[PDB]
């Protein structure tokens, strides 16, 4: 019910309201960016990171405190992704859908490195600086105490999502399916079992079990093997910026606070859009682009997040979009009835746009979905 501008003013205000005087110096070189930053920030007291940041890129002498800070935040937000640290991995091909590495304990300091990354992200928000690390909306949901949903599974694992939907909409007592409330996990060669609930090894999934099994399994699909690393990140953040300060944001708004808003190239978008059952000459498609033309930039980004799962664009624009199974341009499909809302498949960067009866119908249903659904 509250707008993003209002929420941004109310958060910034609360940061401005908890500031400290003076400054902190952080000295790094381009070649030891990560290690210098890690030590200096972690041997500092967390609240002191709310003071004015003086980042020294030792050797570079082009300066501007807010410009070197800007550059630092960017470079380091990438350097934490270095595979040598074994902290992160991708659920899909071509660096699609970042997630914490369950095997990260092969790095004996991983929990301390994650608490450092937590601090670094809170420093970015607190100082209004931007990062390009590429966290997913479910990761942001966790920062806002939002539980991942059935829809979210399709982003990380469309086949898992479809198997859960099938269970959700079939009769278990009619097909012979035998499942139990327990999951196998193999991390670094060690295979472990996790009970979804007490005694779940012996509890079989029935029609009367189903809904509970699905929501316990959904949570487990996002939390498995990364509980301790995730806790270390959240603590590191909370040390610097109380997580309580994010109470009003949703996950898509939080991603904008950390990534920054940039102006969306309308031509790049339309040239790189592909169509299923529709064409570029379809009634509803030409209506679609009128609704997008009438949107302000804030709402276009929101449309991008609804369909693709992020506001971030690759190098080379919309032609280079990535899905769960590889390259995957923005796509619009004729799916659904006139009584449905538009729904997205973020793994395929797809908008199921029903064959609406009027421009006014499409405009209201599109704007409603991009604002209230995911």
């Amino acid at each position: 019910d509250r707008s993003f501008r209002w929420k941004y003013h109310q958060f910034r205000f609360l940061c401005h309201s908890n500031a400290l005087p003076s400054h902190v110096k952080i000295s790094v070189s381009r070649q030891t960016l990560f290690e210098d930053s890690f030590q200096q920030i972690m041997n500092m007291k967390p609240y002191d990171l709310r003071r004015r940041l003086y980042i020294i890129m030792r050797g570079e002498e082009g300066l501007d405190y807010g410009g070197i800070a800007r550059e630092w935040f960017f470079l380091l937000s990438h350097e934490v992704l270095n595979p040598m640290y074994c902290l992160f991995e991708y659920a899909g091909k071509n660096n699609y859908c970042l997630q914490i590495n369950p095997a990260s304990s092969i790095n004996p300091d991983h929990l301390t490195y994650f608490r450092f990354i937590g601090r670094f992200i809170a420093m970015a928000l607190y100082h209004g600086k931007f990062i390009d690390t590429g966290f997913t909306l479910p990761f942001y949901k966790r920062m806002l105490n939002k539980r991942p949903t059935l829809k979210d599974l399709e982003s990380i694992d469309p086949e898992f999502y479809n198997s859960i939907v099938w269970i959700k909409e079939n009769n278990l007592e009619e097909c012979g399916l035998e499942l139990y409330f327990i999951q196998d996990m193999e991390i670094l060669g060690k295979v472990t079992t996790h009970e979804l609930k007490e005694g779940g090894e012996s509890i079989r999934v029935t029609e009367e079990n189903k809904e509970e099994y699905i929501m316990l399994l959904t949570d487990w699909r996002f939390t498995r093997g990364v509980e301790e690393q995730t806790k270390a990140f959240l603590d590191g953040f909370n040390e610097v910026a109380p997580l309580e300060w994010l109470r009003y944001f949703d996950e898509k708004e939080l991603e904008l606070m950390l990534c920054g808003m940039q102006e969306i190239d309308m031509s790049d978008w339309q040239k790189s859009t592909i169509y299923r059952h529709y064409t570029k000459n379809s009634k509803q498609i030409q209506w679609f682009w009128q609704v997008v033309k009438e949107m302000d930039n804030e709402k276009r980004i929101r449309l991008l997040q609804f369909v693709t799962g992020t506001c971030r664009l690759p190098v080379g624009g919309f032609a280079e979009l990535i899905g769960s199974n590889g390259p995957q341009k923005f796509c619009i499909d004729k799916v659904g009835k006139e009584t449905w809302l538009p729904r997205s498949h973020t793994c395929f960067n797809r908008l199921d746009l029903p064959p609406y009866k009027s421009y006014e119908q499409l405009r209201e249903k599109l704007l409603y979905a991009i604002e209230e659904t995911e």
Partner: peptide
């Protein structure tokens, strides 16, 4: 048939 897809679901989950 429809136990082709239960086997597939069962392997995935």
């Amino acid at each position: 048939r429809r136990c082709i897809q239960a086997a597939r679901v069962c392997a995935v989950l």
